[PDB]
């Protein structure tokens, strides 16, 4: 019986200028034409999200709960985590990270400047000596682009982001970075979804589905997960971390950061005004992904035991949960789900949209995607993940008409490379401009699982072949449903139908060819689909000579992480 937030009256303010509408770049229209369906959320709607996230939490724990928890601790107690030298942690800080309120900035932290490392050290020392005073935090409204869908009641309010000053953030890395990158995997084995690259996630889903006599799966959408995480949920997370073999110093920091940061604390807007008090999960700390995954898995697994799902498998990614089990008859299934929801609700994690049993894999949506099918060169059946490309496109359009620090279009191209909307529209549309500006060599930033990475377009082919396999360049005969969903979308937004992109693709693939080197290996593999005479595509050598290690290991959303 504790509120997720208390508010003072202070508005959530923006620090910069917030553009809500698409500018009208002549280039933007080379992609999307109905630029009035595209929109970005601003701190103008923050008060609506505030109502949504502010609620009371009732939570009753039980035997199933305690049994699973105990099993988790057991596995946790077999993990050993080290600390991180100020230096080591400083390197994990993104070049563009928010500057500290204490004189220095991101580059100063990255460049191990003196003033910075001195504050970072005073902060660390303060964590060891004071284990009670609530650390201060800032609450900003996020600004993400979407498309207008009248079927949902128009537009959606901006999401909130709550984070601590850069000093603290670098400490968090020193104390927990190694833990949140190892504890998760060790406690929930194969259920931990961040250990998989696209090719592996698909493989884990299909295999698990096909491994059931009469498969039955569902996705469980939790209404505002972060807001439901109770203080006991966070102290429980801590007790799990504490199971690891930690340095007496790392233990004091972890305990101190839990009591002072994670379990809640006060918030101020950009103007330094007292905004409110948080008593639920902070969206912008390092343990956000690890914490949500651990806690989402804990409750879910215990609910499976109250509902009696038969031989079930779970795949968790933060607050995103998908469950596949053995069917017990459509009616018994519907009922096992209602008890599942009832158990979850008791664990302080009610849902938004109530879960619904599904019997067709390709009709399940987890991590905003679904399995679909296509065929490789030798006409073999190949599975891959995809989604409605509306948002992806509406954003790929906004990022063409306004410069953005991190661009999703490159993340989508990588993660959804085998899809047809990514290959015929994204690759085509972008490698296009990266020629009308000669930037095939210029590295660009993008996020994956939260971690930030610097990637060069000219390396996409090797990368893709690594996450999706070589088939991803020769997939044909896509399922009609999919082909149709994309086409339907393109018509909605105003994006030239697939045929137009086929033409553009042949062209682009050309200027890229009559440019040889690497720009021609991209036009060769990334566009072998826009030419009748299809050249033979074989294993890329420079595809092995690349370690994508850090990539798919753990999740770091809101963790202010930068991988190099």
Q: What minimum distance in Å lies between the beta carbon of 387 and ligand PH9? A: 7
Residue 387 has which token pair? 């989604």
| ∠ CA 184-185-186, rounded to 5° | 90
**Spatial CB neighbours of 367, under 8 Å, sequence gap ≥ 6:** 193, 201, 317, 320, 322
Residue linked to tokens 């599975």: 383
- Rounded to whole angstroms, how far apart are CA atoms 93 and 146? 28
Number of alpha helices (DSSP H) and beta strands (DSSP E) in the chain: 21, 16
Spatial contact of 523 and 444, defined as CB atoms under 8 Å apart: no
Alpha carbon separation from 376 to 373, 475, 484 (Å, rounded): 10, 5, 20
Q: According to CB under 6 A, which one of 198, 350, 389, 559 is a site residue for ligand PH9?
A: 198
With CB under 5 to 8 Å by kind, the binding choice for 218 among Cl ion, ligand PH9, none is: none
Question: How is 114-143 classified by DSSP, letter by letter?
Answer: HHHHHHHHHHHHHHHH-SSSPPPEEEEE--
Q: Which of residues 370-389 bind ligand PH9 (CB under 6 A)?
A: 385
Q: Does 479 bind Cl ion (CB under 5 A)?
A: yes
Return the residue of 28, 317, 462, 474 that touches ligand PH9, per CB under 6 A.
317
Residue sitting closest to ligand PH9 (CB)? 411
Sites for ligand PH9 among residues 419-458 (CB under 6 A): 447-450
Q: Which residues in 425-447 are b (16+ Cβ under 10 Å) and which e?
A: bbbbbbbbebbeeeebeeebbbb
User: CB-based contacts of 537: which residues, under 8 Å, 6+ apart?
Assistant: 470, 473, 474, 524, 525, 528
User: What is the 3-state secondary structure of 250-306?
Assistant: HHHHHHHHHHHHHCCEEEECCCCCEEEEECCCCCCCCCHHHHHHHHHHHHHHHHHHH
Q: Least distance in Å: CB of 315 to Cl ion?
A: 23
Q: For Cl ion, what does the binding mask look like between residues 27 and 46, x meaning CB under 5 A?
A: --------------------
Distance of closest approach, residue 373 Cβ to Cl ion, in angstroms: 8
Of 164, 264, 291, 411, the one binding ligand PH9 (CB under 6 A) is 411
DSSP 80: B
How many angstroms separate the CA atoms of 281 and 522, rounded? Answer: 43
If one asks whether residue 415 binds ligand PH9 (CB under 6 A), the answer comes out as: yes
**Span 505-564, contacts to ligand PH9 by CB under 6 A:** 555, 557
20, 42 in Cβ contact below 8 A? yes
Nearer to ligand PH9, 166 or 417 (CB): 417
Task: Choose between 167 and 450: whose C-beta lies nearer to ligand PH9.
Answer: 450
Which one of 40, 43, 345, 369 is in contact with ligand PH9 (CB under 6 A)? 369
480 binds, among Cl ion, ligand PH9, none (CB under 5 to 8 A by kind): Cl ion
Among 208, 227, 412, 471, binds ligand PH9 (CB under 6 A): 412
- Least separation in angstroms between CB 75 and ligand PH9: 22
How many chain residues bind Cl ion (CB under 5 A)? 3
Q: Which does 201 bind (CB under 5 to 8 A by kind): ligand PH9, Cl ion, none?
A: ligand PH9
Burial of 544 (0-12, 13-18, 19+ CB in 10 A): exposed
Closest distance between ligand PH9 and the C-beta of residue 196, in Å? Answer: 6
Nearest CB to Cl ion, comparing residues 262 and 421: 421
CA distance linking residue 304 with residue 301, whole number of Å: 5
Task: For residue 13, give the 3-state DSSP assignment.
Answer: coil
User: Which of Cl ion, ligand PH9, none binds 412 (CB below 5-8 Å, type-dependent)?
Assistant: ligand PH9
Residue 481 is a binding residue for Cl ion (CB under 5 A):
yes
Helices (H), 147-230: 166-176, 183-188, 198-210, 225-228
161-169, 219-227, 277-285, 411-419 -> range binding ligand PH9 (CB under 6 A): 411-419
From the list Cl ion, ligand PH9, none, partner contacted by residue 479 (C-beta under 5 to 8 A by kind) = Cl ion
11 alpha-carbon distance from chain centroid? 28
Name the minimum Å distance from CB 201 to Cl ion.
21
Write down the least CB distance from residue 467 to Cl ion, Å: 25
Q: Which two three-digit tokens encode residue 35? A: 């630029």
**Cβ nearer to Cl ion, comparing 330 with 484:** 484
Which of Cl ion, ligand PH9, none binds 481 (CB below 5-8 Å, type-dependent)? Answer: Cl ion
Q: Which does residue 367 touch among ligand PH9, Cl ion, none (CB within 5 to 8 A, set by kind)? A: ligand PH9
- Tell me which residues touch ligand PH9 (CB under 6 A): 193, 196, 198, 201, 317, 367, 369, 385, 408, 411-412, 415-416, 447-450, 555, 557
Interface with Cl ion by CB under 5 A: which residues?
479-481
């Amino acid at each position: 019986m504790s509120m997720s937030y208390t508010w003072t009256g202070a508005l959530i303010t923006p620090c910069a200028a917030e553009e809500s509408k698409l500018p009208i770049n002549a280039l933007s229209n080379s992609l999307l034409r109905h630029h009035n369906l595209v929109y970005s959320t601003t701190s103008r709607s923050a008060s609506l999200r505030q109502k949504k996230v502010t609620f009371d939490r009732l939570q009753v724990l039980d035997d199933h709960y305690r049994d699973v928890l105990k099993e988790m601790k057991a596995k946790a107690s077999t993990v050993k985590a080290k600390l991180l030298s100020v230096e080591e942690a400083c390197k994990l800080t993104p070049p563009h990270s928010a500057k500290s309120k204490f004189g220095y900035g991101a580059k100063d932290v990255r460049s191990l400047s003196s003033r910075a490392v001195n504050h970072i050290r005073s902060v660390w020392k303060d964590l060891l000596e004071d284990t009670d005073t609530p650390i201060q935090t800032t609450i900003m409204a996020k600004n993400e682009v979407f498309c207008v869908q009248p079927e949902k009641g128009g537009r959606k309010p901006a999401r909130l982001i709550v984070f601590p000053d850069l000093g603290v953030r670098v400490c968090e890395k020193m104390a927990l970075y190694d833990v949140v990158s190892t504890l998760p995997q060790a406690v929930m084995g194969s259920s931990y979804g961040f250990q998989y690259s696209p090719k592996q996630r698909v493989e884990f889903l299909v295999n698990t589905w096909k491994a059931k006599k009469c498969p039955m799966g569902f996705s469980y959408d939790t209404r505002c997960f972060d807001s439901t995480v109770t203080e006991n949920d966070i102290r429980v997370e801590e007790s799990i971390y504490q199971c690891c073999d930690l340095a007496p110093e790392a233990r004091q920091a972890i305990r101190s950061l839990t009591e002072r940061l994670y379990v809640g604390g006060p918030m101020t807007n950009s103007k330094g005004q007292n905004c409110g008090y948080r008593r639920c999960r902070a969206s912008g700390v390092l343990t956000t992904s690890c914490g949500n995954t651990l806690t989402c898995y804990l409750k879910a697994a215990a609910a499976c035991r109250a509902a009696k799902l038969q031989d079930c498998t779970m795949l968790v990614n933060g607050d995103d949960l998908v469950v596949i089990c053995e069917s017990a008859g459509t009616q018994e299934d519907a009922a096992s789900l209602r008890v599942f929801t009832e158990a979850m609700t008791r664990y302080s994690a009610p849902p938004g949209d109530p879960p619904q049993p599904e019997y067709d894999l390709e009709l399940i949506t987890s991590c905003s995607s679904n399995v679909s099918v296509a065929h490789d060169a030798s006409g073999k059946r190949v599975y891959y993940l995809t989604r409605d490309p509306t948002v992806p496109l509406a954003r790929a359009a906004w990022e063409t008409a306004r410069h953005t620090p991190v661009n999703s279009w490159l993340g989508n191209i990588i993660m959804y490379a085998p899809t047809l909307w990514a290959r015929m529209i994204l690759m085509t549309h972008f490698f296009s401009i990266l020629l009308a500006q000669e930037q095939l060599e210029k590295a660009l930033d993008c996020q994956i699982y939260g971690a930030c990475y610097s990637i060069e377009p000219l390396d996409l082919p090797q990368i893709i072949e690594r996450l999706h396999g070589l088939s991803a360049f020769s997939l044909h005969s896509y399922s009609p449903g999919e082909i149709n969903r994309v086409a339907s979308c393109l018509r909605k937004l105003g994006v030239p139908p697939l045929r137009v992109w086929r033409h553009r693709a042949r062209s682009v693939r050309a200027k890229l060819l009559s440019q040889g080197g690497r720009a021609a290996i991209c036009g060769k593999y990334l566009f072998n689909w826009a030419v009748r005479t299809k050249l033979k595509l074989t294993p890329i050598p420079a595809a092995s000579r690349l370690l994508l290690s850090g990539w798919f290991v753990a999740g770091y959303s809101g963790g202010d992480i930068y991988h190099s």
